[PDB]
């Protein structure tokens, strides 16, 4: 009924990590010229040991063999007006994360995250995307970072094939991280604990990871890893991109080696600073991780404006405030924070 339905890619060369076919879930919207393509998150692995361990304990993130044939859209993928006041009628696409590579892989464990996005788009042309006017590439966590890496690729691809009437845009949620110093230094062993900078150096070589050419050209060769960090990729992006980022992201803190005060401040403070020249943003002062596909994404507010209203104001100003960093230095100084 309102279910998004599973499709597997007709090009079987484009796969999940274990060779199973990749795919996408879709709920078509009679009428709408608006497309929402959401990239799922779920960490990553950068060497054999970590990927083997991910494969045994979090196998859904590496294979499509057990994917259910349908799933219900939630938050911004919801078709219920109460849950998704402005976007409920869009064409809804969910792209499951089965490449453990922050959607950067292009080598044909296989790491193919960038080609999966590429392939999904090509398929959707023949499903009404050909007749589309707005394409919003959204994603949470690793999927939030994957938007940054892919949004201009997706734009370029759609010109090449003869579809300049589609406007590609980005929404990066909980995907904007700092390449910073750890609280308590430690070796690059576990995914959860390895430092942000070393993790991706490892990752990019392991995944034959590719980054957007406009960021790539403007770095020394073998230095491509820099382009995983929002502040370094962003000013280079041609596509308009809205940034949703908790000031105190739980994933950020886990790789900075915190386990539940002067350090916190510095992080929270620099986040404000990295975001002061991104005009499209929504950074509530809470302790959390991800929001755009949670049903309670309508409850959060900064400066009187909800997240759904901010994105709408952002959308209106592209065809009502849009830059909204919550103003304090402490998690739980904002009464509408979740749970
Ligand atoms: C937070 C680690 C440094 C960020 C570097 C590259 C992007 C990876 C983002 C993965 C977020 C991990 C949490 C998740 O995906 O649910």
Swiss-Prot record:
The chain holds residues 86 to 451 of 496 of the full protein. The active site is at 141 (charge relay system), 249 (charge relay system), 289 (charge relay system). GO terms for biological process: bone development; negative regulation of canonical Wnt signaling pathway; negative regulation of Wnt signaling pathway; protein depalmitoleylation; regulation of bone mineralization; Wnt signaling pathway. It catalyses: [Wnt protein]-O-(9Z)-hexadecenoyl-L-serine + H2O = [Wnt protein]-L-serine + (9Z)-hexadecenoate + H(+). It comes from Homo sapiens (Human). It is an enzyme of class 3 (hydrolase). Carboxylesterase that acts as a key negative regulator of the Wnt signaling pathway by specifically mediating depalmitoleoylation of WNT proteins. Serine palmitoleoylation of WNT proteins is required for efficient binding to frizzled receptors. It is found in: Secreted. Belongs to the pectinacetylesterase family. Notum subfamily. This is Palmitoleoyl-protein carboxylesterase NOTUM. Keywords: Glycoprotein, Hydrolase, Phosphoprotein, Secreted, Serine esterase, Signal, Wnt signaling pathway. Glycans are attached at residue 11.
């Amino acid at each position: 009924n309102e279910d998004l339905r599973l499709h597997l890619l007709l090009n079987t060369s484009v796969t999940c990590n274990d060779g199973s076919p990749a795919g996408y879930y879709l709920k078509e919207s009679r009428g709408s010229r608006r497309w929402l393509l959401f990239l799922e998150g779920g960490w990553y692995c950068f060497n054999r040991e970590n990927c083997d361990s991910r494969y045994d304990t979090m196998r859904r993130l590496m294979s499509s063999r057990d994917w259910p044939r349908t799933r219900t859209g939630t938050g911004i993928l919801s078709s219920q007006p109460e849950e998704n006041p402005y976007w409920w009628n869009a064409n809804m696409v969910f792209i499951p994360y089965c490449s453990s590579d922050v959607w950067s892989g292009a080598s044909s464990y296989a790491f193919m995250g960038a080609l999966i996005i590429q392939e999904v788009v090509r398929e959707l042309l023949g499903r009404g995307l050909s007749g589309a006017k707005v394409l919003l590439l959204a994603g949470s966590a690793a999927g939030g970072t994957g938007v940054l890496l892919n949004v201009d690729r997706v734009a370029e691809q759609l010109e090449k094939l003869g579809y300049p009437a589609i406007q590609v845009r980005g929404l990066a949620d909980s995907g904007w991280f700092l390449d910073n110093k750890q609280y308590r230094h430690t070796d690059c062993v576990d995914t959860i604990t390895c430092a942000p900078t070393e993790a991706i150096r490892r990752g990019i070589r392991y995944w034959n990871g590719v980054v957007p050419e406009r960021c790539r050209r403007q770095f020394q060769e073998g230095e491509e890893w820099n382009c995983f960090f929002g502040y370094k990729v962003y000013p280079t992006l041609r596509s308009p991109v809205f940034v949703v980022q908790w000031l105190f992201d739980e994933a950020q803190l886990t790789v900075d080696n915190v386990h539940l005060r002067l350090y916190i401040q510095n992080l929270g403070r620099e986040l404000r600073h990295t975001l002061k020249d991104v005009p499209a943003s929504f950074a509530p002062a809470c302790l959390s991780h991800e929001i755009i596909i949670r049903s309670h994404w309508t409850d959060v507010q900064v400066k009187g404006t909800s997240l759904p209203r901010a994105l709408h104001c952002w959308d209106r100003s592209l065809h009502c405030p849009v830059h909204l960093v919550d103003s304090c230095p402490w998690p739980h100084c904002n009464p509408s924070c979740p749970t």
